[PDB]
Design a protein around this ligand. Sequence first.
Ligand SMILES: O=c1c(O)cccc2cc(O)c(O)c(O)c12
Length: 273
Amino acid sequence: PHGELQYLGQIQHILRCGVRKDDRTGTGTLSVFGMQARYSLRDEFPLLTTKRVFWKGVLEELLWFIKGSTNAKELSSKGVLDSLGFSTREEGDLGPVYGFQWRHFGAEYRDMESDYSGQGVDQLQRVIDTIKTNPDDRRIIMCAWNPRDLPLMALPPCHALCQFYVVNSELSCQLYQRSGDMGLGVPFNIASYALLTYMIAHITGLKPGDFIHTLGDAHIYLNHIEPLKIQLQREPRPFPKLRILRKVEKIDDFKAEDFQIEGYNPHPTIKME
Ligand SMILES: O=c1c(O)cccc2cc(O)c(O)c(O)c12
């Protein structure tokens, strides 16, 4: 039985048992606390089939993140409350934000054109190195922050924690998100971290295993209920495959054309606010 049925069952559960709760901007959601789903990565790829998921932008944004870019324009050229500073956000400089954290966590930030080699902890290279040096390690963990939180406090809570896990030649990944937007973010995140798992697995000589997605505040924005009610009447189709087209060595060497989705036949796009 389909992994996508988990996602559908969770939409249904929120629209049946979710309670009203407002987000940051006093905007309204249906919310349930604590959920999880598992998607096999073995000989398939969890790109949701009940609406067409924007795969090329999942890929391109992950590449931007892997590059550690803080330049909005290095992504914008793919067509895909955070504020401080006049000349710099005209520029497109986002500050020490997003992928900066995966590749240079904790480095004093200069500008977006600066050279940061060997500055701060490279969480991502560290995960890859640990998988190679000690596959049993229970600490293969990479965190991400909402940029808005960084200036806001000391020891600010992560938005996402990712933990990899190896047994019997299989690479699994668990993504824990302190909140998840079920209509828009969640399918995008499932594909994004399954893609990352496929990349790490490839450069470390392992086979992808499971992607496990865990949420704290799983929620549906009031304005997505109706389109989601309609998405629920669609029957999932077999997940596609992801194929890597070249042999790749190092996680920074990956390019968009290294990747090819196969047998992807989704139901039409659903637009949600
Ligand atoms: O300071 C931290 C920080 O500002 C961000 C949030 C979580 C962290 C987690 C750590 O394990 C670590 O060694 C840290 O320095 C932090």
